Amino acid sequence: GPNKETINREVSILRHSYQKEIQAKETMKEVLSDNMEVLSDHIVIEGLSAEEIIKMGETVL
Amino acid sequence: GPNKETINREVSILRHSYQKEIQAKETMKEVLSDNMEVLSDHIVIEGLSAEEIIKMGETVL
Amino acid sequence: GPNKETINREVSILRHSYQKEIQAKETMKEVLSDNMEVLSDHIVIEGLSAEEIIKMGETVL
Amino acid sequence: GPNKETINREVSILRHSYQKEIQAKETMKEVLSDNMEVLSDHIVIEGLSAEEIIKMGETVL
């Protein structure tokens, strides 16, 4: 019924799949790197403290 | 022909594959937890209403 | 080893992982919505044209 | 037990699940595109130096 060319056809694209998964973590990684450098840039300071800004985000959105 | 070692292989990576997935929603929920943090950081401000601001630039980009 | 139960395990988890994937596409579109807003938000205006600054940083990084 | 059909669903939704993984890469490459513009556009200069705000961000952030 089955055929060695079938079990392999699966196990084949099977390894290729995992690949995309690990390559993924490599992408989402570069992202957070960006989201991170950002928070640092807009991290207000002096004259205004992120806390005061939150105070405006605590009363009402 | 087919060999119990080959079905087990694909089934082995299978379990590992799911792992990456769940650990994916984890790093994902983080990417947003940050993105939102920055958004809710500025938030609408009297005088510097982030909302009103956006409008001003929506009239003529 | 070869037992319709083992291939069914790979197929059953398949639909499960699939769901997570499509759903992921949903959380992805979100990352953009939060991005376009984060961009159209800080987009400075009146005083410093996002173009003038952007260009200035173009001459050199 | 072994049904060349039950495999077809598997080996078929297989080549499919793939087209998804690479698809998500399409949305991902999209995110970065906006992620970059976001940072590259807010790159503040003259008055506030990201280098300074980066120094405080190096203290422990």
Q: Which of D3, D7, D34 to mutate to test the interface with A (most CBs of A within 10 A)?
A: D7
Domain residue ranges in chain B: 1-61
C21 vs B25: CA distance, rounded Å: 10
Dihedral sign (CA B9, B11, B15, B20): positive
Nearest alpha-carbon partner for C39 in D49, B35, A52 = B35
- Architecture of the domain spanning D1-61: Helix non-globular (6.10)
How far separated are the first and last CA of chain B, in Å rounded? 66
Q: Please, what's the b/e burial string for D38-48 (b: 16 or more CB within 10 A of its CB; e: otherwise)?
A: beebbebeeee
Asked whether the beta carbons of B9 and A19 are under 8 A apart, the reply is: no
Which DSSP string do the residues of A19-49 spell out, in sequence order?
Answer: HHHHHHHHHHHHHHHHHHHHHHHH---SSS-
**What was the structure determination method?**
NMR
CA A15 to chain centre: 22
Nearest alpha-carbon partner for D31 in B28, B51, C42, C44 = B28
Nearest alpha-carbon partner for A2 in B4, D4, D57, C1 = D4
| Contact residues, chain B to chain A, C-beta under 8 Å | 1-2, 6-7, 9-10, 13, 16-17, 20-21, 24, 27-28, 30-31, 34-35, 37-38, 40-45
Asked whether the beta carbons of A50 and B38 are under 8 A apart, the reply is: no
Provide long-range contacts, Cβ within 8 A and 24+ apart, for C11-17.
Answer: C11/D6, C11/D9, C11/D10, C11/D13, C13/B14, C13/B18, C14/D10, C14/D13, C14/D14, C14/D17, C15/D13, C16/B18, C17/B17, C17/B18, C17/B21, C17/D17
Q: Which residue of C has its CA nearest to B51?
A: C41
CA distance C40 to chain D (A): 9
Using an 8 Å CB-CB cutoff, list chain A residues near C38: 38
B37 vs B26: CA distance, rounded Å: 16
> Vertex C19, ends A34 and C35: CA angle to 5°?
25
